[PDB]
Amino acid sequence: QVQLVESGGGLVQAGGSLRLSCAASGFPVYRNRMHWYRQAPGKEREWVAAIESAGQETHYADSVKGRFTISRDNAKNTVYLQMNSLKPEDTAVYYCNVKDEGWYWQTYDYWGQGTQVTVSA
Amino acid sequence: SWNSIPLEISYEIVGWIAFASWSISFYPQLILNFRRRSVVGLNFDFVMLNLTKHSSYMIYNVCLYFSPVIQKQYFDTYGDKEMIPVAANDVAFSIHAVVMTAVTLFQIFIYERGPQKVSRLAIGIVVVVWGFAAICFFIALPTHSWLWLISIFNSIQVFMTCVKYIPQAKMNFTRKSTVGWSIGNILLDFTGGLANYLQMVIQSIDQNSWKNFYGNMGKTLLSLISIFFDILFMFQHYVLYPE
Ligand SMILES: N[C@@H](CSSC[C@H](N)C(=O)O)C(=O)O
């Protein structure tokens, strides 16, 4: 019953900015630590950014740090990845993510469907 | 002093089963973290507190299994004809659990990432627990009362076994589903708790003495808390919150 719907992705020229979106059903975004991840052709899923639950605190990978900004619109139940200063490198399917973190057993990752962001040099 | 060879064998087999069904469940996380070269999802506090738990238990099992000086104190306190309530597999589990907990700590530094460092109320816990241990060590030193001190390390392992199962069950309750329910893992934890209780009982049936249950009250409460919480998790999942 929780759903994650990505949108905003597509082709943009290197140097360009995109604003990725993540529509969230079945759960409040402000009451949760929300993540963005990415999968490139042949590469493995890379953690990209995360925002803290009841707080504005944000953490970013060294590959996107400074250029990517993860925000949250509680008033629309959506998470955003304002991905700025893009480079062809960043070509990957970006998934928004929300985990049901466990104490001892495995943590349950809720993925989205994906939105290709292809940066063209 | 084993009287019965069949019983001694049974005690050894269920003892090695307890080591199998418990130590095997450390690997799925380690495999996952290597494959992904990341630990964004692991509860860093839990791994830290599970190292403390596994170290207290390790001190008790290794010291009672390898110190004649501590064994002499075990025979003075609990009785002359008493069998030491620590088995080879108890020592093997403790050494293998501390090793697998330090490897996951290696994976957390070397892979890490995300917004997880956790280390507040949890770190606090480690401070108070190793500080308490330290006070107790200086109390046991002026008389070389080593068996009393390793009985504290085992009480600390009991405390941390509660720290393992309580917050987990507490999450499932304050939330709803049994999210993260692993039938395999839950079955194997249950298995280790029954096998470790059965081991103690087989030792009691042979020597004809229930004193092993107080001599190693850490292992008696470890198994019973494990079985109790597993039945609860079962009873969360199979009834109280299906999905
Ligand atoms: N058998 C022990 C626990 S060791 S399992 C530790 C591992 N990190 C996990 O639970 O996933 C008990 O009686 O609770």
Task: Report CB contact under 8 Å: A104, B168.
Answer: yes
Ligand 1: residue whose CA is nearest its atom 12: B226
Report domain extents, chain A.
Answer: 3-119
Closest by CA to B219, choosing from B237, B192, B243, B240, is B192
| Edge-to-edge order in the sheet of strand A18-25 | A3-7, A18-25, A78-83, A68-73
Please, which residues have CB within 8 angstroms of residue B110's CB and are 6 or more apart in sequence?
none
Grouping H, G, I as helix, E, B as strand and the rest as coil, residue A16 is coil
CA distance A26 to A41: 31
The radius of gyration of chain B's CA atoms, rounded to the nearest angstrom, is 19
Tokens of B35: 């494959």
CB A48 within 8 A of CB A54: no
B190 within 8 A of B223, measured Cβ to Cβ: no
Please tell me the distance in Å from B119's CA to the nearest CA on chain A.
14
Residue numbers in B near A100 (CB within 8 A): 175, 179-180
Q: What was the structure determination method? A: X-ray
Assigned architecture for domain A3-119: Sandwich (2.60)
Written as six digits, the tokens of B205 are: 């049936």
**Closest among B177, B180, B189 to B240, alpha carbons compared:** B177
- Quote the domain boundaries for residue B175: 5-237
Q: Which tokens go with B54?
A: 């596994």
Answer yes or no: is B43 within a domain. Answer: yes
Count the domains in chain B: 1
**A82-113 CB burial, b ≥16 within 10 A, e <16:** ebeebeeebbbbbbbbbbbbbbbbbeebbebe
**Cα gap B25→B27, rounded to integer Å:** 6
**Of the candidates B234, B144, B152, the residue with the CA atom closest to the CA atom of residue B193:** B234
DSSP E strand stretches across chain A: 3-7, 11-13, 18-25, 34-39, 46-51, 58-60, 68-73, 78-83, 92-100, 108-110, 115-120
d(CA B186, CA A102): 14
Report chain A's terminal Cα–Cα distance, integer Å.
40
Report yes or no on B243 lying in a domain.
no
Six-digit token string for B232: 């609860």
Distance from CA of B225 to the nearest CA of A (A): 15
DSSP result, chain B: --S-HHHHHHHHHHHHHHHHHHHGGGHHHHHHHHHHT--BTB-HHHHHHHHHHHHHHHHHHHHHHH-HHHHHHHHHHH-TTPPPS--HHHHHHHHHHHHHHHHHHHHHHHT--SS----SHHHHHHHHHHHHHHHHHHHHGGGT-HHHHHHHHHHHHHHHHHHHHHHHHHHHHHS-S-TT--HHHHHHHHHHHHHHHHHHHHHHHHHT-TTHHHHTHHHHHHHHHHHHHHHHHHHIIIIIS--
Which DSSP symbol is given to A64? T
Q: In this structure, are residues B93 and B19 in contact, taking their beta carbons and an 8 Å threshold?
A: yes
Select from A1, A78, A81 the least CA-distant residue to A37. A81
Integer Cα distance of A96 and A79 in angstroms: 8
For the beta carbon of residue B206, count every other beta carbon within 10 angstroms: 18
Q: Cα(first)–Cα(last) distance of chain B, in Å? A: 52
Contact A78, A68 (CB under 8 A): no
Distance in angstroms (rounded) separating the CA atoms of residues B205 and A41: 62
Half-sphere exposure of B21 (CA within 13 A, CB side): 21
A44 touching B (Cβ < 8 Å): yes
Beta carbons of B195 and B21 less than 8 angstroms apart:
yes
Task: Read off the tokens for B203.
Answer: 């030792």
**Tokens standing for residue B64:** 């009672």
Determine the distance separating the centroid of ligand 1 and the alpha carbon of A109, expressed in angstroms: 22
* Distance from the Cα of residue A106 to its chain's centroid: 21
Answer yes or no: is B184 within a domain: yes
Please name the member of A44, A57, A106 whose beta carbon is closest to the beta carbon of B36. A44
Confirm if A79 and A72 have CB atoms less than 8 A apart: yes
Which residues are registered as beta bridge partners of A51?
A: A34, A58
Nearest chain A residue to B32 by CA distance is A106
Phi then psi dihedrals of residue B178, to 5 deg = -115, 45
Which DSSP category does A30 fall into?
Answer: T
Per-residue HEC secondary structure of B26-52 comes to HHHHHHHHHHHCCCECECHHHHHHHHH
Tokens of A55: 């707080």
Please give the single-letter amino acid code of residue A65. K
Amino acid at B156: I
